[PDB]
């Protein structure tokens, strides 16, 4: 239920997102496991800044969901690709990852 909540939260973000397209987000090369959600958490900083018109509660609650999902055993280091992405493609990518990781 955590994943689908994250998916809908990411679907919510993408749906109500589409100036702020100049911000540069970054993605992992591969994202196939729950522990890869660390890479999403790492980009919530800039994701918060673009989020302009108390959305803090939205990002904050996405983060707690990510922390519940990524695991507790280890601190996975994320490996980012150098190629940047708009706030839109970034959101679509993680949405796709969520749908991807649910159905297994």
């Amino acid at each position: 239920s955590h994943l689908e909540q994250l998916l809908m939260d990411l679907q919510e973000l993408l749906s109500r997102m589409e100036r702020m397209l100049t911000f540069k987000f970054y993605l992992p090369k591969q994202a196939t496991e729950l522990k890869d959600l660390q890479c999403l958490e790492d980009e919530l900083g800039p994701l918060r800044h673009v989020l302009d018109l108390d959305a803090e509660n939205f990002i904050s609650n996405i983060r707690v969901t990510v922390v519940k999902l990524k695991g507790s055993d280890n601190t996975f280091e994320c490996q980012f690709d150098d190629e940047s992405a708009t706030v839109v493609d970034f959101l679509r990518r993680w949405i796709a990852f969520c749908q991807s990781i649910i159905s297994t």
Binding site: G45, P46, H49
Partner: protein, 223 residues
């Protein structure tokens, strides 16, 4: 790729304010959040706050809520920090630095810093230094090394700069930290050169004290 430069009054009186400038070149100012950081003389970095030139929105440290005011002029590529109700505790070096999400990850977090500029909060008035030679008082016996110096005495406020032969002597230079006594600073600067370099050519210290618009060049001569 980008440079930051801070400037502002070097000497300010207690209870008054000071306005510091942060001039960015190499890139537009709209791409950055401009943060200010201060450092007390013996102390660490201390986050003051930030402003985004596009939004003019501002964030403040607790201790600077009633003290600091950030402004920006996008047209002149410059942000400003006004510090009010100045006390001696506000005596510090002030830096500006940046945050950006318009480029790579490695450029987001305080990747660029200014050189920093010193502000002294005091009631004392500006005083120009006197510059005295430091020359060996025993005879110069060749093929050895020799240490020469300049005593920079009785100035206020900090800082002064010292070069030797306008920079051509950089190694073997020791410029010591100023010491304060009776409201006036004193520092020494030495240079070590071969005994044969002293006789063949000039060894001169170039001293500047911007606060008093003083430039002094003192040629060091045998005694």
């Amino acid at each position: 790729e980008v440079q930051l430069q801070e400037s502002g009054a070097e000497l300010v009186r207690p209870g008054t304010s000071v306005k510091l400038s942060c001039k960015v070149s190499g890139d537009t100012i709209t791409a950055y959040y401009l943060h200010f950081v201060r450092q007390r003389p013996g102390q660490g970095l201390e986050w003051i706050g930030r402003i985004d030139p596009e939004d003019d929105s501002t964030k403040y440290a607790e201790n600077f809520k009633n003290k600091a005011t950030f402004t920006a002029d996008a047209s002149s590529n410059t942000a400003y920090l006004r510090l009010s109700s100045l006390t001696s505790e506000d005596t510090a070096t002030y830096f500006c630095t940046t945050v950006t999400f318009y480029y790579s990850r490695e450029l987001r977090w305080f990747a660029y810093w200014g050189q920093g500029t010193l502000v002294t909060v005091s009631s004392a008035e500006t005083t120009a230094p006197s510059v005295y030679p430091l020359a060996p008082g025993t005879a110069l016996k060749s093929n050895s090394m020799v240490t020469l110096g300049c005593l920079v005495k009785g100035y206020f406020p900090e800082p002064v700069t010292v070069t030797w032969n306008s920079g051509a002597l950089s190694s073997g230079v020791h410029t010591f930290p100023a010491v304060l006594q009776s409201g006036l600073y004193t520092l020494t600067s030495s240079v070590t050169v071969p005994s044969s370099t002293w006789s063949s050519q000039a060894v001169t210290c170039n001293v500047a004290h911007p606060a008093s618009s003083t430039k002094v060049d003192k040629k060091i001569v045998p005694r």
